[PDB]
Symmetry: C3
Subunit: 278 residues, 3 copies
C-alpha cells in the first residue's frame, strides 16, 4: 500500500511539475506574441496532395482562349488563336483596387493544379486583337485555396486581402511561361496564417506559322504547376518548436532545485564550522 | 582508494544514463520514421567545392553546337551557328518515359560546373534548321552528381528516378538563359537522400547579324552556374538536431528523479504528521 | 535572518551556475568557430521598412534614359526612347575587375526601394543606338545597403567585395523585367555578415510603335522591388539559438550532479552490505 501510494504521489507531483512548466511556457508565449518583428524559424512538411489554389488572372481586354488540365506534358496545339476545349472552374469577380481606390480591376480566378505527385498542370491561352500599350502582359496573383474564396462570405474583401499579399507577377506576350509555384505559410502572432507564393518561371519563345493577316493579334500562354510537394512553414522560433522551450524551462527549474539543495547543505556546513570554531 | 572507486562509479553511472537516453532517443526515432509526412527542418552547409552535377539536355532534333567551360565571363562568339570548340564530358543515353511508357526520350547529359568559388560556368549552343512546333524549347533536368550516373549499374533506372525528381525546366530559343542552380538535399525517413534543384534564370535576348538566308534556323543558348556555395539540407526536425531531443529527455529523466525525491520526502513528512496527530 | 541569508546564498549559487554554464558555452563557441564549413540554420525576421539597397548597373555604352520611384503601379510611358523625368540617387564609380585585372568596369549605382509595405519600386530605362554584340544585356548586382557604400572609406574595395558576393544577374533588351529581390544575410564564423540576394524575375515583352527609323536602337527596361518584408538570416546552428546549447549544458551538469548523488548513495549501500556480510 505504501509503495502504490508513493507511485500515485509520483504521478501527482509529475503532473504538478508539468502544469507549472506549461503555465510558465504559456506566460512566455503570451509575452512574446505582444512584441513586434520576432525571430521566425522555417519548417518544411511534405504533402501527398496539394489543396487547390486560386490563380486570379487580369486579362483586361484579353479574352480567355482555352483552359485545360494536363499531366507532365503539353499536347501540341490543334490551332493557335482559336477558342474551344475550355473547361476550368473559373469565377469572374471585379472590385476596387485597395491601393488606388479610383480603379476597378477585373479578376479571372482559375482553380489550380492539386496533384503534385502526378505533375498536374493547367494550361491557359489568351488572345488580344488590338492593344494600345508599350508592354503586353497579364497580371496574376496566387492565394492559398480556391475553396476558401469560393465559400467566402465577403468576396470583395478576400480579393483585397490577396492583393495585400506579396504573390503578384506577370507573364509576357508571345511566350509560354512555365510557372512552378511554391507554397510558403507564415503564422502571425495574432493567429492568422498569411500565405505567400514563390515561383520559378521558364520563359519559352512561341513560333507562329499563322498567316500574316492575323499576326497583329498577340497570343498569351501560361502554365501553372507545383514545383515540389514540400510546403515551407514560417513561425515564431519559440512557438514553432515548443519542446526546446519546455526543455530549457525544466532545466532551469531543476537547476533552481539543485541550488536549493546546495544552499541547504552549505548552511549546515557553515553552521557546523562556526560551532566548531566558536 | 574510496575516492578513485567513487570516481569510477561516477563514470559507470554516467555511461549508464547516456545508454538509457540513447535507447529512449532511438525508440523515439524508430517510432517517428514510421509515420508519414513529418515536420522537417532546414540546415545550410557551405562547401568549398561542389560535386560535379549532371545536366541532361533533350535536344531532340537539335544538334549540339559547342560546349565549353568558362570562369565568370563569356568571351564573344567567334561565329554563331558554326560547330567547333566542343569538349565536355557528354554521355548520350535514351530510354522510355516513366510517365508515358509509349515515348522514348533522348537525353544528353553534360558534366556541370564544380568550382563555385571561381564562378565556373558551362556554355552550350544548339542549332535547329527545320522545326515543326509552336514553341521552341529544350527540356533539361539536374541531378545530384554526374559521377553517380557514370558509375551507376542500372543507367536506365537512374534516369527514370531523376525524371521522378522535381528538377525539370526549359530554356527558350533565340535567348541565352543564365541558370543559377541551387542544391537542395532532403533526407527521407527510409534513409535515401532525394535531391532537387532550385534555379534563378536570367533570360537575355540574342541579336543576330547573320544573313537572312540562315535566319530560318534557330540557335539555343544556355549557361549553367552555381548560385552560392551553400547547400540546403532538409531533414526530420527530431533527427536533424538530435541534441535538442537528448536535452529534453535528460530534463525529463531528471524531473522524474526529482519527483521521486519529493515523494520520498513527502511520505516521511506525512507519516510524521500522522504519528504526531495520532 | 537565516531564511534571508539562505535566499541570498541561493542567488549566489544560481549566479555561479549561470557563470559556469556561460563559460562552457563560450568555450564550445570558440572551438566551433575554428572549424570550417559548419552546419547553419535559417531564421526569418520581418521588417516594417527595408534599408535602401544599392543596384549597381553596368550600362557600358548604354545611356540611362529615365529613373523614377513608383508605388505598386507603372504609369504608361509618355514617350519611349526619350530622356527626362530622371531623379534617383545615382553614384558613378568604375574600377578594375577583381577576377580579370586587365578590364575596368563602369558601375552605375542606384538607390533601391525601401518601403516594402507600400510596394515601392524603381523603374529604369536605357538606350543604345549602335551595338556590336551577340546578346544585348546589362549586368547588375545588389549589395546590402546604399548608405554603407556612400560613406565607405575605400569605395573601390567595397565594390570588389560586392563583386565577390553572389548576387549578379542580367536583364534582356527589348523586355521589361520585374525583379523581386529577397535579402539573405549569412554570418561567417569570423564575425562579418555576408549578404546575398535572391530574385524572381518576370520577363515582359515590350511592344514598340515607334517609327522604323529608330528601330535600330534598343531600349532596356527593368523594375526592382522587394518581394516580401521577411529577411532570411543564416547562422551557425549552435550560435543562432544559444538557448538550446544552454539547456543541453544545464541538463548535462544536472545529470552529473545526479550521478554524484547516486554514487554517494551506492558507496554507502555497498559498504553496509559488505559490513553485514563480513
Ligand atoms: C525564464 C527562464 C529562461 C527563459 C528564456 C527563454 C525565452 C527565449 O528564448 O527568449 C528569447 C527571446 C529573444 O528575442 P527574439 O529577438 O529572438 O525574439 O527573448 C526575448 O526577446 C523575449 C523573451 C520573453 C520574455 C521571457 C519572460 C520570462
Ligand atoms: C518521452 C518524453 C517526451 C518526448 C517528446 C519529444 C518527441 C517530439 O518532439 O515529438 C514531437 C512530434 C510532433 O509531431 P510532428 O507533426 O511535429 O512530427 O510528436 C509526434 O507526433 C510523434 C512523437 C513520437 C512518439 C514519442 C514516444 C515517446
Ligand atoms: C559537453 C556537453 C555536450 C556538448 C555537445 C553540444 C555541442 C554540439 O552541438 O556540437 C555538435 C557539433 C556537430 O558538428 P556540426 O557538423 O554539426 O557543426 O559538434 C562538433 O562537430 C563540434 C562540437 C564542439 C566541441 C565540443 C567541446 C565540448
Ligand atoms: C470538360 O468540359 C466539358 C464541357 O465541354 C465539361 O462537361 C466537363 O465537366 C469538363 N471536365 C472537366 C474536368 O473540366
Ligand atoms: C465587371 O466589369 C463589368 C464591365 O466590364 C461591369 O459589369 C462591372 O464593373 C463588373 N461586373 C461583374 C460581372 O462583376
Ligand atoms: C480611397 O478609398 C478608400 C475607400 O475605403 C479610402 O479608405 C481611402 O482613404 C481612399 N484614398 C484616397 C482618398 O486616395
Ligand atoms: C478578335 O478577332 C477575332 C478574329 O476571328 C474575332 O473572332 C473576335 O471576335 C475578336 N475579338 C476578340 C477580342 O476576341
Ligand atoms: C578540350 O578539347 C580537346 C579536344 O579538342 C580535348 O583534347 C581536351 O581534353 C579538352 N579539354 C577539356 C578540359 O575538356
Ligand atoms: C537512341 O535513339 C536512336 C535513334 O535516334 C536509336 O539508336 C535508339 O533508340 C537509341 N540509341 C542509343 C544511341 O542509345
Ligand atoms: C506503361 O508501361 C509500364 C512498364 O513497366 C507499366 O508499368 C505501366 O503500367 C504502363 N502504363 C500503361 C499501360 O499505360
Ligand atoms: C543544318 O544546316 C547546316 C547548314 O550548314 C548543315 O551543315 C547541317 O548539316 C544541317 N543539319 C543540322 C540539323 O545540323
Ligand atoms: C525629382 O527630380 C527633381 C529635379 O527634376 C529633384 O529636384 C527632386 O529632388 C527629385 N525628387 C526625388 C525624390 O528624387
Ligand atoms: C570611368 O571611365 C571613364 C572613361 O569612360 C574614365 O574617366 C575613367 O576610367 C573613369 N572615370 C570616372 C568618372 O570615374
Ligand atoms: C591581376 O592583378 C592583381 C592586382 O592585385 C593581382 O593581385 C593578380 O595576381 C593579377 N593576376 C594576374 C597576374 O593575372
Ligand atoms: C543616340 O541617338 C539619339 C537620337 O536622338 C541621340 O540624341 C543621342 O545623342 C545618341 N547617343 C546616345 C548613345 O544616346
Amino acid at each position: 500500500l505504501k509503495n502504490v501510494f508513493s507511485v500515485l504521489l509520483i504521478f501527482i507531483y509529475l503532473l504538478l511539475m508539468a502544469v507549472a512548466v506549461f503555465l510558465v511556457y504559456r506566460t512566455i508565449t503570451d509575452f512574446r506574441e505582444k512584441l513586434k518583428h520576432p525571430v521566425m524559424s522555417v519548417s518544411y512538411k511534405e504533402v501527398d496532395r496539394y489543396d487547390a489554389p486560386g490563380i486570379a488572372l487580369y486579362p483586361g481586354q484579353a479574352q480567355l482562349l482555352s483552359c485545360k488540365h494536363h499531366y507532365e506534358v503539353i499536347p501540341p496545339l490543334t490551332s493557335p488563336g482559336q477558342p474551344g476545349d475550355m473547361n476550368c472552374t473559373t469565377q469572374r469577380i471585379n472590385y476596387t483596387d485597395p491601393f488606388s481606390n479610383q480603379t476597378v480591376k477585373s479578376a479571372l480566378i482559375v482553380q489550380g493544379p492539386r496533384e503534385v505527385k502526378k505533375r498536374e498542370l493547367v494550361f491557359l491561352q489568351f488572345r488580344l486583337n488590338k492593344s494600345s500599350e508599350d508592354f503586353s502582359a497579364i497580371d496574376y496573383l496566387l492565394f492559398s485555396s480556391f475553396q476558401e474564396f469560393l465559400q467566402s462570405p465577403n468576396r470583395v474583401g478576400f480579393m483585397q486581402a490577396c492583393e495585400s499579399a506579396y504573390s503578384s507577377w506577370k507573364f509576357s506576350g508571345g511566350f509560354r511561361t512555365w510557372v512552378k509555384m511554391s507554397l510558403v505559410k507564415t503564422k502571425e502572432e495574432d493567429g492568422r496564417e498569411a500565405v505567400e507564393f514563390r515561383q520559378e518561371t521558364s520563359v519559352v519563345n512561341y513560333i507562329d506559322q499563322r498567316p500574316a493577316a492575323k499576326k497583329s493579334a498577340q497570343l498569351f500562354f501560361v502554365v501553372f504547376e507545383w514545383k515540389d510537394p514540400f510546403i515551407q512553414k514560417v513561425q515564431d522560433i519559440v512557438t514553432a518548436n515548443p519542446w526546446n522551450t519546455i526543455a530549457l524551462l525544466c532545466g532551469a527549474f531543476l537547476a533552481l532545485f539543485k541550488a536549493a539543495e546546495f544552499a541547504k547543505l552549505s548552511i549546515k556546513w557553515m553552521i557546523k564550522i562556526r560551532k566548531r570554531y566558536l
